[PDB]
Design a binder for this molecule. Sequence first.
Ligand SMILES: Nc1ncnc2c1ncn2[C@@H]1O[C@H](COP(=O)(O)OP(=O)(O)O)[C@@H](O)[C@H]1O
Ligand SMILES: Nc1ncnc2c1ncn2[C@@H]1O[C@H](COP(=O)(O)OP(=O)(O)O)[C@@H](O)[C@H]1O
Ligand SMILES: [Mg+2]
Ligand SMILES: [Mg+2]
Lengths: 74, 375, 375, 160, 118
Amino acid sequence: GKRQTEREKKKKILAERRKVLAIDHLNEDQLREKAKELWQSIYNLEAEKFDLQEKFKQQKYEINVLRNRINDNQ
Amino acid sequence: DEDETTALVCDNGSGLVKAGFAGDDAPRAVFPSIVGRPRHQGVMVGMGQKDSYVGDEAQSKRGILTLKYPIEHGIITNWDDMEKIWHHTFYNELRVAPEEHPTLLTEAPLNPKANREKMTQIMFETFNVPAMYVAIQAVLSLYASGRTTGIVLDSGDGVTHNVPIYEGYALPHAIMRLDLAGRDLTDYLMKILTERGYSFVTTAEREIVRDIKEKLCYVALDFENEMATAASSSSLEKSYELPDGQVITIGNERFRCPETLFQPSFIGMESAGIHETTYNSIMKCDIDIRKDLYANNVMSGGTTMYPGIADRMQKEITALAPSTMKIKIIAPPERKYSVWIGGSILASLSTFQQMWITKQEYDEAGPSIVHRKCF
Amino acid sequence: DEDETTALVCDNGSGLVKAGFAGDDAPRAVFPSIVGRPRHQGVMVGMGQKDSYVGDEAQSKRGILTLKYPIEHGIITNWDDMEKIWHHTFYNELRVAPEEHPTLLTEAPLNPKANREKMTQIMFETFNVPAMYVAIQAVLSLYASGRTTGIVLDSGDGVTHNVPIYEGYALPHAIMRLDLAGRDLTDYLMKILTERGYSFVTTAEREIVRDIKEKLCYVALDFENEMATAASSSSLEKSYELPDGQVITIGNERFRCPETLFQPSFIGMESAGIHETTYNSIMKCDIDIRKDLYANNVMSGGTTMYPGIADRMQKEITALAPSTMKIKIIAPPERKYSVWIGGSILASLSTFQQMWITKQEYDEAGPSIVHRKCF
Amino acid sequence: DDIYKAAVEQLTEEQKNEFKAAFDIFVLGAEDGCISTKELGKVMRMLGQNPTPEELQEMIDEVDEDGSGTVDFDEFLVMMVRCMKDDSKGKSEEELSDLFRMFDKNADGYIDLDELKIMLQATGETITEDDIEELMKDGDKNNDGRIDYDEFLEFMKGVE
Amino acid sequence: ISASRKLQLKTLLLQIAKQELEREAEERRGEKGRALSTRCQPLELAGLGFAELQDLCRQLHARVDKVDEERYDIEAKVTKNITEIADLTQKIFDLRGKFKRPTLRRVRISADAMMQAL
Ligand SMILES: Nc1ncnc2c1ncn2[C@@H]1O[C@H](COP(=O)(O)OP(=O)(O)O)[C@@H](O)[C@H]1O
Ligand SMILES: Nc1ncnc2c1ncn2[C@@H]1O[C@H](COP(=O)(O)OP(=O)(O)O)[C@@H](O)[C@H]1O
Ligand SMILES: [Mg+2]
Ligand SMILES: [Mg+2]
């Protein structure tokens, strides 16, 4: 139950998000432009990965906020 | 949460759940395994109106809730109950996310293999723990004692287990489970108190009488002689102040309640006292090491906070076994946390991460992988 | 009428009707539940000659009218009387049309279900209220106190109800109704005043003697000792100035009238005093919370304006119950309006319009829908 | 004094302009220009509020400290700022939670006293005793040792 | 009047708070930039062999796949966090209500009326 749903939902999401290249036929110039584009894409992904990490930390902080609001409530 | 990715250590003992972080000396979130549910339906508004109540919340709301046990003597009723209580423990009590910390769990001795396969599967699907390890509480108590030789008497709230381990090797052929535990103690005390004039059925009084067992109960040195002298016993008779304020006086019952484990014929068990179960366990294995088993017996569990188990234990074993070698019991104070301590000990060493049960192994071989990964 | 479509809040308490708008602090139109009718027939002309007289009009015209009670101890005599008095309240006293404002009503505890079905049906047919909600006055007084734990003593003019509610949950199994109320008080005082030389039967003197109860009556700390010292008691004996001008002097009767509720054997009730009724109510429920009930008792009703209920209450409960925990009563001044205040509180929050009893639900399922819509 | 400029800062321009141009409903001609204290209650009815004898008499006590029987414009502004509590047209809360993040510099979930002391001295004013003491009385209620987001919001209500 | 002092203390406090907000935001941006420089170093394609550039494209495909996977894991963690935020926040609203709900509404306003009209 839900064993395949989770795994293949995740794989489906990563399939629509990522783009597949028919690398074998790619021409020399094409390897040039595309490896530049792929490196830039990885650059941006790491950029807002770091943003996600930071904002993960702050959302942890607001969890801290709300859980303390709860414990004081007794 | 600690900056380091240290593991979670959780003892789901049969009667108490004690959870915390690896490298800690004592579990942080410790609560009894009772679960309360709304005794009636919803018509009011503005507050409450929540189904599951766990932990101290249910302890405060005992009167309004039907108090149910998601586990009894190892048997599992509803996995949803464990799901909710683990959610509560991890987020409301431990304030930790299981995504970034592998979990070391302890299970009741000789728990069902099907139970292990289902609980592990629901766990892995529902939760996102990175890695897993589950161990028997017997070796955990052994680790807490830190001596590879001895017979462990694990007295939980659903089962009492006798397990011999010599030089850090399990002896399943000489391991037994007895259906006497806290539940029986409360029941027997309930019927005796009924014969004393006080007849209650609900769980609040169950907790009151187990508290009485924690505070006032004796383990009789000699049974019938102590009731004979307890006929009047103004000094020996002891009283308790119930939270409502009434003074309830109990005499011989103090040492007539735990005696039932030693004398099961009171309420009809074919099996004799637990000392006989340790005795048979000892002789089942080779003769020679039996003396060491006599001298290295360990007892573990929350019940062990009561007095009288040690003296009774040694005297009866010496009566049954030859009295040449000296028998002595060892029991560190606050040993109900000891299992969890041993869990921390497991995470202490750097070899423990060689056999973490990772997500991908379970994804490859299903739950069946544990059949080859733990044992 | 306010520009906003805010709801109507009406407490039809057993003895007083208090009506007004939601969001208001106190009810605007408050009148006793007496109804006057022409004692004789019509021959004169030029003025008057009107059948129903309600409110202060009947209070001024008490002498000329047969004074009748459309409700007594919850029992309903004639729905036409309620029709007329509600017409008067809505249009002549509240100056409001019920077409544009839903109504929140409060009913006497444990009122007949058939009574609810008939009153709701006649209401919906006769009137054009958009939406409906009716609630027990017990939870309303609870809301006025703003504490989910306690036992409510509702002392109306027809019935006295004891209702325990723990953590905002009704306990019908421990709820009781006692047929002692203002009517009994007036009756008993009537017979004692008859033994004092003044014998009246009509309702004007009933109101005079209830006014005397409002002004001069005591609650005896010790009963027979206070009549023993009230033998002469020139200072302790107290007088009243009746509107005709005669000075009527009363001594021990001041504290011998409310005592009858505490000592029903004076005029022959099997049930003991109302403190016994609160005591039994408390023990019927689980033992543990009983202490909280002792410490959280609330009293409500117009009678509560009298002195002496608090001291008598606590002393007798402490006599009956163990005196370890301290018992204290809470009673805000002018608590007879408190129920209506709670009605306003109900309209304060935005979830209340989720369960308004609309016209179309009643048109679909008849009156029977309330059986599923309120409870 | 500092209360006059604090009342200036804590109230928006449109509100105070309407307040003054509407106080000019009592003056008609050949008058001192400052109306009697009791007439102040009447302008409040114009404001849309319905105050009560207790607050009215108290508020009356909140004007004319030196005992002239009359109200000036600066006392007028301070009392108005002290009347409706809906300052800043509803103080925000989200960015404020960001500012809650700001009070904490160790990422724990709350505000330490040392973090408050450094925060206060970063303004330019040193530490005095009545400062932190009164700030603690304003912020806390039960000696919990910290300022959480509820006490955070409560303490600075209306402040911009 | 101490209220003046306290109010201007908290005003200056919150203004310096806004300054610290700006500064911490700048520090976050700088740390993001340096982590960008250290996680994704400059390009390597200058003078490379076409076949190796095929292999490089496949390697960057695997790289983008796994870093998308890591992003998915982190954002899922955040989503669980936010759900707990919402539930706990509702509990907060109710719990605060317990201490302050019966205490803010009209106070003798209607009591003020024409007691002589009757
Ligand atoms: N402080 C204490 N003193 C005495 N008895 C206790 C105490 N705490 C728990 N117990 C008893 O221990 C029982 C729970 O046993 P537990 O420690 O959960 O077994 P296990 O070691 O298998 O987890 C309870 O039924 C309770 O009666
Ligand atoms: N101001 C007062 N002082 C003393 N007693 C009063 C006062 N007003 C009403 N009562 C008494 O209260 C009784 C009506 O009770 P009521 O408040 O209608 O009960 P309920 O709370 O069930 O509506 C009347 O019989 C009257 O004797
Ligand atoms: Mg045990
Ligand atoms: Mg009443």
